[PDB]
Subunit: 336 residues, 6 copies
């Protein structure tokens, strides 16, 4: 009934709801294209598995024979440009679709994040409705809490196998820790009269095509590469707080007045899901340092340190970058 | 010992600590210049009395004879430009000082807000030290709570008289109400694991040299003139929330897409004391509407309404404008 | 419900300087055409001069005195500033003011007469009907103002409502009346002196807009007209100097600003020519205004001249000379 | 006593009063350089003789021995760029000076228009003057009226001879007529309480690298090439004045609204001596029309090349006005 | 049959092949307009005769009856702005056309350089050609070698007569020499696997409204006025090449570092026929020096006015390069 | 504690293509001068070509094979990309890489020899000492690469360490060796054909940088050199076309982009000339790159050509031809 069927998701993990839709797709179209979103996002409690792992997981639920008509595509996130995303999807799809006009998109409008499901009017849209009782969020929560009965009856058996092997790895132990932390963090705000909103700053300091970075020291994202930034204090201005944090986390050897006078731009980042803590809006300041020897910063140990990274280094380690920091850098790179 | 002595304050109200310093000034200099800060700020729980009232209050504590060597100056706030403030102080002072170089500034470095006390190196600075037990904040709190024994023994007798007459007015009843509200508002956050930070948007919509305004409907600032704005919701972007609030408070008859496409600039306002609620940082969006008939907006009743105001109207009613909204408008007026 | 009139609202715009019998005829026509009438007092807060001698509360008192309290229940007075170089701004102000009364009604008519060039605004309200009344001969506020400052009572007493006559007879004893006569005479002599010129004269002046730290350098006028009004430093261009030279010369004469000419020269960020034909009552005066932005810090000393804040300018709007507030507005 | 000596002037005409300084020059320096100012300026009552003609005059007054240690250099006027002029001057100097550092400039500050003798600081300046009094203004005045007695005693015999021959000239008639018109024009303002001040607009209209020009229909500079321009009326804005004047003088086939919309810039030209009628300040508006057919319109479109070739025939300072909007 | 008729060409020289179209023109329209292209272009082996000279030639070939219904119009070249050219063409047309709408343009698209006959769309176009074959390239080739037999049978008797007289000319020697040099230069590249491609830099140095110029020391266009410029060496960047070339040809007294810092702009000039040596693309760098003394340096500073006056003596397309950075 | 060496750290930068006996002599000198030696492998991730035949892990394996494990405890290998038009970027990368080893020490010396124009970088580390070694005759990596691709073993076997000889003898049997010989021969013939030209030839090409929605239009190279590498669409300028025409012509030839020339013409936002003397191995090639920004939406179809994301370009850095990555970087 269609030559091509597209199913997009994160599949973190692939569950019985997803398989139902993936089965429906196999009925409605000859070739099936699975699009693995959030490609190369750093692993966190919302996206635990890398996209090759997610492909293996899905493949393990299907037969070699049905796999003959199944195509995997991975697509990065561009949290601040839907158009860069759309284009990448079109381009990845085209390479399979030849160019055909016989194409459906299967999905369910679950919530606010499902808005993309109608940015393909070019193609047809098959809404599936909700399938009770299959919730990725519930599955992940159960899994990090070690409650097997709340997830085993919700994933394909090949998925349960995978979750059980993966339960042995270092990543799982780190993700359990990070999950306990967030849960406690959110719980500590449970008696607020209103959902809280968090304000942070971030410093984007660039010298001779390099950006000053740190390894995160506090949860969440412990150990990931990040911009130097943090929570605004009650009595400081955004610039002040930005400078205070830059100094605390990098001990950059440049006097505060030249730092101030080197701020050439700033920009607010407010994607509602940028941070799992929390609604967290960050104010990023772009600082351009002049030519010369690379500026000195604390050489603490290695997990304690700060260092300078070129764009090449940045792309090379894309999946080690915290939250949307790669996007913040890319925004100011478009400015220069 | 000096030809001229400068004492700057808000004096809300003038208390025994202030009188001590004002007396010390009268010993140390021939002429005394009192500078009434926060001129033409809308009345709130932090600045209850207008600057002519504050002058009357101070005059009532002094004798006609000593008043012969006392000079009053009023100066506006410019929360985002210390330089505009400094200049205005210099200019107001010069008109009394003739131009003399014999000038001291008396004060006490109480807290972060006292930072201005050393932006006059031109002139000498006499630090007085703290005088125990004389706190404006404590005085105001006591007064709005009606607890006379906590303030009577802290102000000059002429000040106690004034507070007692003023306790009859409509302003006092409104300020009591507003004070109860804030107190309860802050108390409701008392069990937060961290001081909360608030995020709001504000829309600065301009057509044919007019700015769209509202009369505030919620406390605090009930009844004051304000920009249309409000709290960001958890799942909306800043622009989205800005547009949602503009529509809720003005029902402006301009379709959302043309509104979006008319945003020409935005700017963050983060003076830590802009709002008495709360650390509240607002994100203001400047929208330029094209020439033509003045856009329709809700004509509700009068306290329920929205309307268009020229800069002239704005200056004419400066002391009816909420928090720092006049400053936000002035920022974008410097852009055009 | 059957209306007794064609429209809900009638708008009658003017200076009314003073209200004369022509104006009352149109006002009466408006009372026949609309249930409620809106009088718009233009030139609100303009420095009293020979073209605009009465302030808006005086003009409202004058018109009120011609009308019975039953009619006054149907009349609403609104004031609106002039913004000589910005018609869009003015159009919006009129609209916003009218809306306080109108509640948004679309049943609205503007009454007037396209008298001369200054009446162009009558076709800028297409959202409302327009009712041309034709000319009433000859009622002329210019002629009436002339007769009044010249003391020729026979030429205006039969041109104005009896209540206006009374008000005029009373105002005639004020200090403002004397001040106005003095200024009227000066302008009359001034134009006199050019009467034998082969063409109408065109005057060239320069004005200096000097700004540092949100303050504009202003002076009090030492010569007529507008004697004692607040103004920008400026004056007439001499025959052998450039505009910039004239500008700086005149700035030094009037303020004695303690800044070297060479740094004043280098501090000129912009300039603009202001040429509204009626900006000055002395004759056609076209002015060259120069925006000078001083590097921040302590304000330079001057010798009456002073640094005035933007808030203070708005606060003393009505003491400002000619178009000078608009000149400042243009730059800051 | 000096290797090289420089004397700059308009010499309109060359008078005894120059000659004496010229003589004083030949004494103080071995080589003498005479710079003829105002090169290629349209002929008018301030500047009647072309620079070749002025060369001829100053030559006749010299015997060849002398004429053979004197070099003649012409310099254009750029009324609004002194730097450009100083440069053109010192570059033309080098042609002869070769690069010498033993140089003297002679003259004296007579008025305001003699300001050009503080710069140059790289050479030595010897002040003569005042020689009271020979006055070219007075001499051109005398010469144009007919008061022969007032100037024969004032200029060298050879000059007088050339002036004499020139009276027959086709130009002398038109230049006489111009002198009468200006003297009358100025006279008509004598009852004014203050010196009058004239305001004009000029339109600079440019399409496909051509500027719209006209021949002047009215005195002064009648028949010269000019920008469309005129006197502001009492009740029009500068913009509306510029536009009516443009339509009057050229009847340009472009709708008024499109013309308003095509204004990309404007500039005020205010040199005190730009107009001989008295102090006239002009407001120039630069209109820039989209590519394509040249619009219908003596008025005609003229290229930047055309203008340069005919710089001689351009009114007043209209060339500098054009140049200002072009670079 | 038509009121007005237009025929545009370089006519270098006027050949039988033109004449026939000219004849065909006189037949089809009552008035004939001949537009002499390439007006004021320095004389070179593609364009040997000035436009007055070309007028003279085409006149001799006509009897006055005929010569009296033919008008001659000159148009400059602006190699990089066709619009400017089209405009100058149709404006000069109107001088004669008065404003007529019965007009025809004659010729035919021979090659790439004949593209200019699609525009104009406002007139009627009648295609002649091809007339196989008379070839000016071949004729100028013959003429410059000495192969008389190759062109006498190709051009009108009067043309031949003028060419004959011209052989004696001071120019014909230098133009012959140029032809030999180019033919040799091109010949030296015959063993190349592909047509060669030349890269040069030019420096456009500008202070106080003057541009630095030089006389060409090397063939081609020897002795003409040019920008300081040269061939890129194998291991220098364009910037460093431009700068060494600038110092070589002018010995400009300004430190290299200041010169780097004063570069405000650069532009590539790439018209296929700009250089007669073969495909040469030049990279022009615009250096803008601060006001004051003109720096020490045949090289000399030259005003925009000077350049316009001497446009005749300017190499290749160097005038257009200057003009590009000025407006 | 008494040091046995002058410095704590010695830095030796090169391509080492291949490591020969000259390099080993300097390396040995560095081991005498510093306690720890840092070898910087330049040209990391550059597409293998006749100037850079071995990738950095191969070059590290090669140098490792010449050294005893006791010496290797003192040697540290670091890699660094080329950024042909940005020396500041490169200088910073070297500094940052060195700092991983140095801990910030100031006791640091760079050893090398100012051989030719490409050695300019040796004076751009003033924060460190420089030790000029002088020239060793004649060891030449160019000559050794020449002999090796030409199969003349006598000309290089005695120029290189025995371990390098072994590695060379082994690599010689790979498919990459054949590919390199093929390309070497092509370039050699190419230059051959120009040998009788009166001056060194200068080549002119155009390149098109077409971008829509964060994607650059790329091709796979159909002709040598760099056959099968990813590249921008471009080629040689024809004799009678303009650069823009050439650019568009060549863009159409190589990609068959379904966009009309007139809209391609109107979409050129910027252009830049790239002229590093060694950008291309064929001879001096100077290129004109044109930035074309297509209006957003669906990407236009093409016919091998494709739209490549900026992330994918970085991911496939090493498959890119000549300086093309730097050309893209310049614009986006
Ligand atoms: N600009 C951008 O970078 C951009 C924009 C939009 C989306 N994205 C990316 O695309 C991906 C979006 O995928 P997702 O997070 O919505 O995928 P998901 O894994 O949550 O769900 C995949 C699909 O299955 C459906 N589904 C899940 N549970 C269901 C249930 N129980 N019943 C019926 N249907 C159910 C979902 O609605 C969805 O259509 C993410 O990677 C996101 O980051 C990127």
């Amino acid at each position: 009934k269609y030559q091509y069927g597209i199913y997009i998701g994160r599949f973190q993990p692939f569950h019985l709801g997803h398989l139902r839709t993936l089965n429906l797709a196999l009925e409605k179209a000859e070739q099936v294209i699975i699009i693995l979103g959030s490609h190369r996002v750093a692993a966190d409690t919302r996206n635990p598995w890398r996209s090759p792992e997610r492909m293996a997981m899905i493949e393990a639920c299907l037969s070699p024979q049905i796999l003959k008509r199944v195509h995997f595509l991975t697509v990065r996130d561009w949290l601040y440009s839907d158009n860069l995303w759309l284009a990448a999807v079109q381009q990845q799809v085209l390479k399979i679709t030849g160019g055909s006009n016989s194409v459906v998109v299967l999905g369910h409008r679950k919530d606010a994040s499902s808005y993309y499901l109608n940015l393909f009017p070019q193609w047809d849209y098959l809404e599936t409705g909700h399938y009770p009782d299959f919730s990725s969020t519930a599955i992940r929560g159960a899994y990090f809490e070690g409650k097997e009965g709340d997830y085993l009856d919700k994933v394909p058996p090949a998925i349960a196998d995978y979750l059980q092997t993966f339960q042995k790895s270092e990543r799982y132990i780190a993700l359990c820790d990070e999950y306990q932390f967030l849960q406690a963090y959110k719980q500590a705000w449970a008696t607020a009269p209103y959902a809280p909103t968090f304000i942070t700053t971030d410093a984007v300091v660039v010298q001779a095509g390099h950006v000053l970075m740190v390894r995160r020291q506090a949860k969440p994202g412990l150990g990931l590469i990040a911009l130097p930034g943090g929570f605004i204090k009650q009595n400081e201005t955004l610039v002040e707080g930005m400078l205070r944090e830059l100094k605390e986390e990098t001990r950059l050897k440049v006097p505060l007045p030249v730092l101030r006078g080197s701020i050439v731009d700033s920009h607010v980042f407010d994607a509602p899901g940028r941070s799992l803590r929390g609604r967290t809006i960050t104010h990023a300041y772009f600082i351009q340092l002049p030519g010369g020897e690379l500026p000195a910063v604390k050489g603490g140990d290695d997990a304690q340190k700060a260092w300078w990274m070129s764009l090449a280094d940045l792309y090379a380690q894309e999946e080690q970058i915290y939250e949307d920091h790669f996007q913040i850098i890319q925004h100011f790179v478009s400015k220069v």
